[PDB]
Amino acid sequence: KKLLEELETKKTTIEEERNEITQRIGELKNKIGDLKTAIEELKKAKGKCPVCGRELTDEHREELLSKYHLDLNNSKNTLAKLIDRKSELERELRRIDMEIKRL
Amino acid sequence: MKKLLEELETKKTTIEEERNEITQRIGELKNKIGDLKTAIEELKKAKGKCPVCGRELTDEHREELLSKYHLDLNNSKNTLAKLIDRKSELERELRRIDMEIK
Numbered sequence A: 001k002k003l004l005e006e007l008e009t010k011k012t013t014i015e016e017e018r019n020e021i022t023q024r025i026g027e028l029k030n031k032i033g034d035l036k037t038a039i040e041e042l043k044k045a046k047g048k049c050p051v052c053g054r055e056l057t058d059e060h061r062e063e064l065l066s067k068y069h070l071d072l073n074n075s076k077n078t079l080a081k082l083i084d085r086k087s088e089l090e091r092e093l094r095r096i097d098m099e100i101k102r103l
Numbered sequence B: 001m002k003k004l005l006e007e008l009e010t011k012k013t014t015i016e017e018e019r020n021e022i023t024q025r026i027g028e029l030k031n032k033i034g035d036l037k038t039a040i041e042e043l044k045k046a047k048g049k050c051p052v053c054g055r056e057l058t059d060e061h062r063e064e065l066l067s068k069y070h071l072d073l074n075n076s077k078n079t080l081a082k083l084i085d086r087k088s089e090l091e092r093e094l095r096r097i098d099m100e101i102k
């Protein structure tokens, strides 16, 4: 019985992880999108920001570019890892059920 | 005669020059129109800071800037519609000058 209890609790723990990961994947995609369109605009700068109009030097443009591309890649590496993790948790869930149904 | 002919050739050329400048305006204009649409798209994303350079972008400045860009966008589209119609007309006149020339 306590075995069943532990399985049921482990199952809710997995679903919580899977639901949080699902939410993280969505946010990361939004972030990745924002980074790309930001990098796009930034490349059009030539002394002034094309979005807000304020002064933006080639030096800063460049640095802002390096920073955003580093943020973009890291977010894509995390996205990929999140996807794999979600797929793994789904197999665990199917398996945790397997054990339950039996008991 | 020979002077009528000259006048016809000289007018033909002034029309091609007009037609060629409008063509160039249209190209620039279109690119300015795409730039305003992309600047507005990014600007709609601001919430305290400019999403592009990270500077402070207050909600008040965002709306004002959004007003200016929308205003320049619609106008640019106004001029563009006009230039295209003018160019279409100049080409009508060019075809008409050639006839007169035969």
Ligand SMILES: [Hg+2]
Binding pocket: A049, A050, A051, A052, A053, A054, B050, B051, B052, B053, B054, B055
């Ligand atoms: Hg900016």
